Amino acid sequence: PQRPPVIWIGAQECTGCTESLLRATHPTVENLVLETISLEYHEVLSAAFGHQVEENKHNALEKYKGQYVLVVDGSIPLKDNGIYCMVAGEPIVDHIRKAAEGAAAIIAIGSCSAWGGVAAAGVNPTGAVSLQEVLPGKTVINIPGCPPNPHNFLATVAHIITYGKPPKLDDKNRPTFAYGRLIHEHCERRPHFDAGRFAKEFGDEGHREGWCLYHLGCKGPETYGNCSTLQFCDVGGVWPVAIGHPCYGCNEEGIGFHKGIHQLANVE
Amino acid sequence: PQRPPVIWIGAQECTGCTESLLRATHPTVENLVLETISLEYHEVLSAAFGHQVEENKHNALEKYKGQYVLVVDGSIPLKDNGIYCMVAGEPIVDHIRKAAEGAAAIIAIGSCSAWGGVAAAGVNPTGAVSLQEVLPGKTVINIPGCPPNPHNFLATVAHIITYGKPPKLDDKNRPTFAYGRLIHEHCERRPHFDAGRFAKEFGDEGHREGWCLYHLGCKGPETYGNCSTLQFCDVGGVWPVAIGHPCYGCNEEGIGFHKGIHQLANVE
Amino acid sequence: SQRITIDPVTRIEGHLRIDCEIENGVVSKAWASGTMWRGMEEIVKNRDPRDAWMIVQRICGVCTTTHALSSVRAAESALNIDVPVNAQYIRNIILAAHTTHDHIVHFYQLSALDWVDITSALQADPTKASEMLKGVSTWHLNSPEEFTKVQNKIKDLVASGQLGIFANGYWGHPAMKLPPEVNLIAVAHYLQALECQRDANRVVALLGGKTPHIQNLAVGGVANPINLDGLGVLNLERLMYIKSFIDKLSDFVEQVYKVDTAVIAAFYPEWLTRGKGAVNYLSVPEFPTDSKNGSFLFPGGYIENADLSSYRPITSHSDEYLIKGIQESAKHSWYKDEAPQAPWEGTTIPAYDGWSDDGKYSWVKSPTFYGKTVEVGPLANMLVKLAAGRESTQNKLNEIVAIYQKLTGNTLEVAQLHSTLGRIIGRTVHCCELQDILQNQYSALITNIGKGDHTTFVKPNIPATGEFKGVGFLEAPKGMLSHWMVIKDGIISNYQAVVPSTWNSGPRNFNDDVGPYEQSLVGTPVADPNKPLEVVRTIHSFDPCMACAVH
Amino acid sequence: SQRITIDPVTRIEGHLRIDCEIENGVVSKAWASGTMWRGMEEIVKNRDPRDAWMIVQRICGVCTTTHALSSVRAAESALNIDVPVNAQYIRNIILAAHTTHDHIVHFYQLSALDWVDITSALQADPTKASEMLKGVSTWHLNSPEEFTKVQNKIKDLVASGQLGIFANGYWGHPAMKLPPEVNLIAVAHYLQALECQRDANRVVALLGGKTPHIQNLAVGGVANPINLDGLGVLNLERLMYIKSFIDKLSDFVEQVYKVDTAVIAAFYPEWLTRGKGAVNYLSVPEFPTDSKNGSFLFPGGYIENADLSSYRPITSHSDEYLIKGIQESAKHSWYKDEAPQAPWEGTTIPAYDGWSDDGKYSWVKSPTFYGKTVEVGPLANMLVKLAAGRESTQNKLNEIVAIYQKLTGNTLEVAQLHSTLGRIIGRTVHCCELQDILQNQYSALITNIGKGDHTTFVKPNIPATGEFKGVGFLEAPKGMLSHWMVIKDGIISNYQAVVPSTWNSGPRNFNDDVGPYEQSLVGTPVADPNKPLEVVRTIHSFDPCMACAVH
């Protein structure tokens, strides 16, 4: 029984967005690639290398034209004619634009591909941009986070397969089930915020009672996400704030990698 | 009735040893100078100045020859022929040797006169020495501390007046009632030391329960004194360790002004 | 004779090109090239020292945790902060559990398909496959029934005609030497490895707040709030949960990964005689356990000209001999400043001019230690522990050699460890010894909290004037890592990462001396220059990470 | 011309020589000389920054606390440490209580016998003396019976023939203007002052651990452990004891010291017309109350050419304009390097060559502010508060002027404050306003502890490399104090104290300009050149501290 094809291309990626799949449980990465999809291209896991894997890519783009989901992690560097990422002697922006032509759906997994992320921060040495900026006439589904919970991606792909269309998206093309609400508008430490019960330093008495991390720099008030509800790793209770560290805003353009850890958020 | 005469000379003093008298209660400084003694020379309180106060000194040295207690605070600087302390155009060491000639008893009040103290520390810029070092033929009673509890001095003077001899002294000529025991051998935090209950930093849980200050650098194990029993200021409960800070060893030559605050003491 | 390019090299982290001249069917000369740069050292410049770790952790998501930990250690070095011991235990558990995940995934998901022919596993007899492991392993999932289920998953994938990432692989290549049964065993273990690595990352997550990219560090310690009696913080229930995952790792590591390492050596014994990358090796000590950033559980050192007997121990991350030897050159790299640079004085000025065989051909810099090329990573790490007479490392290597001996009738000497397979063996030994690190540091944490020490963080002060230099060393899964921070007027004025894949993958250096990857390939037999499996076998042994190498 | 020397000047701290040229009974030129040096700046060098405060506190035991607090502020400045607000409250209570004792003792024990003739008190009618204070003071210890007891203590001391420290005083000097009754009032108040100053030091002791020389500070905050529920620490019972002594200070300060200040001015009104030492005045703000070493309860500033209307406010101890203006010269001092030195670059190289009128004649250095001579201390402090429009200061001055006006029928204008009596008035105003500082900061501490803040100490880190600079400012009883610390490779490489009596007592400067003591004496009438009481009156008004001036 045939599985829906997926082409995965890394640009200026750190591989964290692929590594998120190795923590997934529904599906596990082995069930993803054996049962859920046909992963037609992914350089991290591919048996083939070099000329053989460039054959696989060209064969897949032709065989599955109009049918595959294209996934990109990393930012795409446009400075100096694309040379800050060169694969098989050609700029990765050209590989991505070629793959985009035949895509049924296109997903930017992680903050780097969704909005430029850390690679486009500060002075932006390589002129790194988002996948949507490289594909202006295409609808890019953005799954931000550094990396996102892998199921923010997997349940988006499942919605496409099972129901034949993307999940509902916000005005930044982010799936609403994962990004529809501010973290601070669904955070279990909001009672402590409301009461003025704040950690002032790691290890202080408030910190050691699980009080609100706003005055440590928590960016929950200005970051859309599901980190407080879905959390991470499916063990229960695991997200940065629950472990004792403020949200850094890694989901949200202009917050993560721009504002200092301890810089205070604006509150709506 | 006539009162016993006292001549007080300050050498390289900070005046803290005189100022200790303004905290005393038995006697208060007003009862000391009106009832207990005749303070014949003391430049901090003297109505007379200049040539008039030098007349007073000479008249008192003559009138009370063989009768007065000589008291010195501050170290005596020998470097460069005495010029680091000049009073009325003469080195203070000459004033002190002249006054020592007619003294009935001689007292070094404070660590500076007792053993050189802070003024003789480090590189010792002025070649500061103790009162005993400048008067090798005399028995100098040492009342160390920076400054000592004033009653360590006042009860020494009272013993001379009331019983006609000095109090019993140790082998450093310190009165046993005040210096006969290590602070650590009469310290109310010894149970905590014994149990391994230690403050590690100011403001930590152990510190805020009044535990032993050894690991903050307490020098009680190597300092003779009465700071834990007589304490200071006669209000009750007031000495450095009770307030939350280690003993620095200010009584003890080679400890105070030599070892760092947080340097650990040797324990017998 | 001819020139080939392998681009992309797959089953690595990031973007690598390998070029080789082949003469008389053997590689005569090679070029290693990192083909992607981000400028992470420039991105972090001018920021508050406390912010760097969250940014530079994103150098790499495979070796997540490592750049975060090296960054806080660099700031702590510059600022003269002693990390609380509970924060060391937590950092250590994270690094040990992460490294366990990292090595397992390297051996199975990244490397196994260089040595394993999945098509050949379809010909296996599952009962004969199971019979081959009697008295070789005590693992509980080597039954014929397990192997038949795995063989049926291979059968179903092939039947679908959608091989995807298994497509157009090196099936039937003459360098594929495993019997059908051993191929099937390896695929069963590949799938079982995914469960073990998942458990290892659950340890990481419970202390880090997630993984990839932990979020529990600080310059001055950790953000975990220790309170056995606290709701919503790191209490005894949470610690018990961590322990439940630590306990799940050992059996797979000891009874599957360790045994497979011996079995691959037994079937590929010529790979003990090729893939030497260097004659000099470096590792730093790791897992500090005292209140002053020292008392390491694992030792470090420097080996010169493969002489273990005269190696130089390294017992401190403040060792001036280590610090002063490290430089990087960009003569054959796409940066402007070419003379060797000490990293506190490093620049990273891009100067791309395209590929030239004798000019610039990589985004990777060329590191040296007092002017010499050095291999880092598990082979270095293992050889330094053997030089130190570490009994645990001796004993663990001997267990792998005893399985090799049982299967082949032959033994393994230290000379054979300077090789593609020795490198793989050093990685497996590391993974095995890390399970004792985890038990040790869990126990140390429980004991210390029981003595009444809940401290985790020392708030830093950063002088607003003055120039302060710090270096953070870490023994990462791929080898010695260092982050070099200069603070001036309260902000980062220079930041330089010298990463273990930089040492190994870096191009020809200022003296045109050849780095470990390029050296290791000389003499590689290549049966089919269009399908150069043998080259990729040696390169994978180094566990390349090119996001790490280039940053 | 006649030449006199006053050596020693008594009823000061330390060793002072004053020389005067007198022309026709008027001082035409003066020399101030500090005759003792210890080298406390050199003694503290080459130590851990954390150790400095315990050593440099011993610069002076009269102004105990001040150098300790300036030293920790200097280290905190260098290291960029924000002091916990509870540590500020405690530091503030200590400094305000200490300064209360300091001012009371200066007015009574050190200064009153310049203005008061004890032998004249023997002729007083105690009932008339008491009646003179009806509707002038509400003090409860002004009865004829109190005054008779005091008169009898004087009678008994005189009858003994052992006058001791009252011997050879200036009894019957023509500059002694008080009637017998007011002399007797003043002696009664001199004895009553000793009880009030003892209560002020009980405040200091309960937080400092003793006085003289407190022992509760730290670089990073204080060593007091706040725990309302703790045995043996700073609990509510201890705080209540502190408050019991704070509450005992006000009545004497307001109903005795403040009143006697007005009364001395009323009897000596020509001393509103002499003793001007300077036309420029400096004070720093004091009593920080926020979490970032600011939000001072008392304001600071810089007045030039006596123009209050155009003064420059100073609201921060990091004020770059204040920091950059301060220099010291040793042209006329016994040190080697003579050009003006910024204190971070200061030297203190002794070069004693004896007394020269036109050469070197003092161990005190010559401070300037952007090249100008400046008076510091309570006259500066009061004038800056009036220029700031501080209503509390204007109101308190007005209460002294109302008593003066009741006795004389005359008001006081600000021009009359640039004088020996204006300097004494500024000191009294300070002492009165400090009682509200104490109530405010005790209340702040109780409130803050009640909110659950028990924090007192931020542990410093001191980089082991780099060179960095800090300065700690403090408004001391004698005026603006600054300690200047340079740290290099983790130890003190330079330490310079610029102390308020250094500003006022320093000798002629690099431009041979005359500093405040020397300038203040020009014009002083001297009725009897063998007994120059009028010179000592003006010098005492500055509250000389020569251990402070010279260190």
Ligand code: SF4
């Ligand atoms: S989004 Fe984060 S985890 Fe994903 S590629 Fe970018 S840096 Fe790596």
Ligand code: SF4
């Ligand atoms: S500031 Fe952060 S910790 Fe506090 S309630 Fe908002 S999201 Fe939660």
Ligand code: SF4
């Ligand atoms: S012993 Fe201490 S208090 Fe006494 S003169 Fe010396 S420094 Fe001052």
Ligand code: SF4
């Ligand atoms: S070390 Fe100090 S605090 Fe502890 S018992 Fe001894 S004297 Fe007391």
Ligand code: FCO
């Ligand atoms: N391990 C790992 Fe990554 C590389 N190379 C780092 O550091």
Ligand code: FCO
């Ligand atoms: N006040 C005081 Fe002492 C002086 N002068 C200091 O500082």
Ligand code: F3S
């Ligand atoms: S830093 Fe990122 S992972 Fe969630 S908690 Fe904040 S958006």
Ligand code: F3S
């Ligand atoms: S520092 Fe001195 S005052 Fe007593 S407590 Fe120690 S001997």
Ligand SMILES: [Cl-]
């Ligand atoms: Cl706990």
Ligand SMILES: [Mg+2]
């Ligand atoms: Mg702290």
Ligand SMILES: [Mg+2]
């Ligand atoms: Mg680098």
Ligand SMILES: [Mg+2]
């Ligand atoms: Mg500051």
Ligand SMILES: [Mg+2]
């Ligand atoms: Mg000075």
Ligand code: NI
């Ligand atoms: Ni003083």
